[PDB]
């Protein structure tokens, strides 16, 4: 069985006061014990989150670049996140393709030099409307997987999970249908199955991102491809207790 | 004039815990010309750790923000976080954040208006490639690149801006320009902020040289009339930083 789970990026979000008041809130969450659940906080955050957040919730980056260290002004290291004790950090997400112009191999890039130095990935991948519109979806995601697939083993996969984003999802309110979820969540599985292994495909999370709230993520996680959830704003709120007990 | 004397140390991405608190250890110890002003930039990460730690006549800065207050921006650091951090300074228009990371003058003017409207004081890097030199346009580009910001922000707001000219071809190459090379180019900037903005702003802008400054050819570069300092990269990770900051004396 794959463990569900729920991340929470908060995005630039956030003062030390409004941290220390949503760090308490989970602190005294009553959480399904089956839910394995990351938080990621702006970078300038993350030691006042990781000295502070109950040990079960880990704590995540929301970037990193490619090097070890060097004349980057303005990146982050994932050497400076291991020594910082993060584990986990969200890659390729929609607001970095797009307002940032990431590419497909560049945040293949981060995803293998997160990987081999320490860290999980949350992999971010989704199509736009138009895209969609165009009969595309497929096309998009699973070239977005093959960028990353062609650089990392598949050993490496373990300490993946793949988040699907509909870029007509986020921050809109307009949420995919378990229906439209589940049949692409079943297609990047089965690309996994056809271009990496069977063991991957079975093992790696997929989860679901966009406008998922309190209101529709039971029916959500109903489906069996779909394995939790990466929410945005709603996890800067108490519905995000809600979200990760999805499934009770 | 009665410019102050202003080094910047750019730590980029370089550090870890305990490398980090021993170069807070070392700047804390040196003994500094207090004549200077005195401004360190280390990853955002670390923002917390060196403002604690580091002794309070150098001021810390970051190495980028955002253009907005709050919002959906994954990855992004914003001006409010950093004066919520007591974080008083920003480094914008950094050359690789220019050339890798694609912002352009409007971005970078965009967020240099942002920091000054929330309380921040900004460094704010200019400088042409050896290409564009190579077709006499330094002055057209180091220009071009200033007017972004001029449109956007008022006379006052330059009081809190230290402007860095940073010839590309010099940034970690060990091609340093000469002092009549970084002169001429600084006599130019000052030129532009009085026909452009004030008397007054050119006269008291600090206008700092970048670009394989070390130990050894400070002392030169710091006698340049239009010289009011420099934006440090490699050598700020290193005891010679002492030796920048203490060009004068």
């Known amino acids: 069985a794959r463990k569900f789970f729920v991340g929470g990026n908060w995005k630039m979000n956030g003062t030390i006061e409004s941290i220390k008041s949503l760090v308490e809130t989970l602190n005294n969450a009553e959480l399904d014990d089956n839910t394995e659940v990351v938080v990621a906080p702006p970078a300038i955050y993350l030691p006042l989150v990781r000295q502070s957040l109950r040990k079960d919730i880990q704590v995540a980056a929301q970037n990193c670049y490619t090097k070890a260290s060097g004349a980057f002004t303005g990146e982050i290291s994932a050497e400076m996140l291991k020594d910082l004790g993060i584990p986990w950090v969200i890659l390729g997400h929609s607001e970095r393709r797009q307002i940032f112009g990431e590419s497909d191999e560049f945040v293949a890039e981060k995803t293998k030099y997160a990987l081999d130095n320490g860290l999980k990935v949350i992999l971010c991948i989704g199509e736009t409307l138009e895209e969609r519109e165009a009969g595309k979806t497929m096309d998009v995601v699973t070239r977005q997987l093959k960028a990353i697939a062609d650089k990392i083993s598949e050993s490496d996969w373990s300490k993946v999970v793949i988040a699907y984003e509909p870029v007509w999802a986020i921050g809109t309110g307009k949420v995919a249908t378990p229906e439209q979820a589940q049949e692409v969540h079943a297609e990047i599985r089965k690309w996994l199955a056809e271009n990496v292994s069977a063991e991957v495909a079975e093992s790696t999370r997929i989860i ?15 489906q069996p491809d779909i394995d939790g959830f990466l929410v945005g704003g709603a996890s800067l709120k108490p519905e995000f207790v809600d979200i990760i007990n999805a499934r009770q």
């Open 208 to 222: 679901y991102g966009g406008s998922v709230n309190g209101g529709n993520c039971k029916e959500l996680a109903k």
